[PDB]
Amino acid sequence: SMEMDEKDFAADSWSLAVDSSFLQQHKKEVMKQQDVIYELIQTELHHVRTLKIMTRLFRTGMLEELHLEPGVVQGLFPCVDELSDIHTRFLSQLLERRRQALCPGSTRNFVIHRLGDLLISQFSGPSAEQMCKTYSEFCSRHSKALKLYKELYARDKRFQQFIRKVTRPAVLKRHGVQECILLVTQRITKYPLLISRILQHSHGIEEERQDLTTALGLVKELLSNVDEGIYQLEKG
Amino acid sequence: AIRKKLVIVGDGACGKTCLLIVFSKDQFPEVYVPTVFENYVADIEVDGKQVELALWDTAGQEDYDRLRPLSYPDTDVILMCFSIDSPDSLENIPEKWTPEVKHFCPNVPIILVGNKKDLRNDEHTRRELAKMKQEPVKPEEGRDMANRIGAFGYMECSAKTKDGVREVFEMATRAALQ
Numbered sequence: 001s002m003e004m005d006e007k008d009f010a011a012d013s014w015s016l017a018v019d020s021s022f023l024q025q026h027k028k029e030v031m032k033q034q035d036v037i038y039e040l041i042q043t044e045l046h047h048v049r050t051l052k053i054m055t056r057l058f059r060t061g062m063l064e065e066l067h068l069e070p071g072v073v074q075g076l077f078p079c080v081d082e083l084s085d086i087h088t089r090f091l092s093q094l095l096e097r098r099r100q101a102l103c104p105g106s107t108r109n110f111v112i113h114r115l116g117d118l119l120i121s122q123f124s125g126p127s128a129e130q131m132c133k134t135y136s137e138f139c140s141r142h143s144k145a146l147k148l149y150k151e152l153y154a155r156d157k158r159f160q161q162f163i164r165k166v167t168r169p170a171v172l173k174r175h176g177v178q179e180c181i182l183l184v185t186q187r188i189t190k191y192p193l194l195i196s197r198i199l200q201h202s203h204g205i206e207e208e209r210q211d212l213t214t215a216l217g218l219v220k221e222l223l224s225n226v227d228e229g230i231y232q233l234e235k236g
Numbered sequence: 237a238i239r240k241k242l243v244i245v246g247d248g249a250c251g252k253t254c255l256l257i258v259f260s261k262d263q264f265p266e267v268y269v270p271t272v273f274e275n276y277v278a279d280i281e282v283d284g285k286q287v288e289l290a291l292w293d294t295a296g297q298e299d300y301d302r303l304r305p306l307s308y309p310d311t312d313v314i315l316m317c318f319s320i321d322s323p324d325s326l327e328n329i330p331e332k333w334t335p336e337v338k339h340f341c342p343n344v345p346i347i348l349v350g351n352k353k354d355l356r357n358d359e360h361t362r363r364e365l366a367k368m369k370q371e372p373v374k375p376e377e378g379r380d381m382a383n384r385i386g387a388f389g390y391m392e393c394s395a396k397t398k399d400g401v402r403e404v405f406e407m408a409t410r411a412a413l414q
């Protein structure tokens with residue numbers, strides 16, 4: 001991650017990230033909305049970080065330090081490049097929408113009035129199909145990925161060394177290989193919770209309510225299709 | 237240290253997320269209660285043993301019967317939650333949750349946890365429940381269900397006041413260690 005974005009999302013909430021002279025000028029209902037929107041963006045930043053740990057630290061390091069066949073590595077990290085592209089793009093639109101909304105003279109005071117449209121975009125059309133297929137693929141390969149990790153760990157002492165090396169920093173305490181795989185699989189099921197709690201504080205403007213309602217339907221439909229498309233692959 | 241995995245299962249709004257959050261921060265957060273929990277790795281010392289305990293939620297996964305089980309591989313202990321203000325959340329323990337957990341994870345210890353025990357002494361909740369001709373779960377209905385499902389034990393806590401939370405996760409650690 002990049003220091004600028006990590007700094008902007010370091011606080012436990014919107015209400016603590018902005019200056020309090022700015023907070024006081026807003027209604028409670030606005031603050032509660034913004035808090036959840038901030039949480040959506042913060043957890044999306046964390047999700048992209050996870051995928052970058054997977055592509056750059058784990059996968060590339062395996063290719064460039066060990067010299068495992070690319071087929072084994074592809075079994076451990078299926079589809080990560082494509083997931084990385086999906087989520088990095090979604091993140092850049094979220095962060096762009098926050099930046100457009102900053103007060104002149106401020107790098108931290110903002111209010112996002114329109115999120116619905118951007119969520120509708122992400123979760124419909126070509127972008128929604130790419131998510132359905134990539135998550136159907138990844139979630140079907142999830143179990144195989146864990147077994148392959150454990151096989152390699154138990155058998156190859158150099159593999160163990162590599163893992164113990166790259167996961168030694170405190171900041172990777174929660175981000176071992178298996179953790180990463182589950183963090184990703186669980187991401188998609190977070191979106192309806194976040195979106196509903198946003199929607200519950202977004203009644204003030206009727207168009208936003210309708211946009212968020214549409215987004216929620218679209219997410220649940222994507223989750224529904226991904227769930228029908230899954231069958232665990234096996235090996236040994 | 238030794239590494240163990242814990243998963244919390246149970247019905248949506250039985251307080252799964254709130255409980256994980258209150259334990260992991262060690263505070264009922266005063267300003268904002270997150271909507272979601274990612275994961276967390278607790279440093280716990282119990283009975284002189286040091287363990288790294290990875291915490292996982294199943295919140296959001298309740299309607300997705302092929303996604304949810306991907307949470308289960310290599311679990312060492314299950315916290316199976318219901319809400320004391322919700323007798324229906326307890327009816328579903330043996331119907332839905334127990335058969336699933338035992339299918340995927342047949343010899344993993346299950347601790348049955350009654351959340352929101354604070355609500356047992358709450359005017360609003362007693363009244364709301366009286367309208368569908370019910371009352372808060374009694375401690376003996378809890379113990380009876382735990383006995384029936386073959387749980388390792390039964391515990392109560394309240395994430396709001398933090399009473400009982402530390403004890404749940406210390407006991408989960410002990411159970412994971414057998």
Ligand SMILES: *[C@@H](N)c1ccccn1
Pocket residue numbers: 308309310311312340341342344
């Ligand atoms: C549960 N402990 C479980 C599920 C699948 C594989 C192994 N264990």
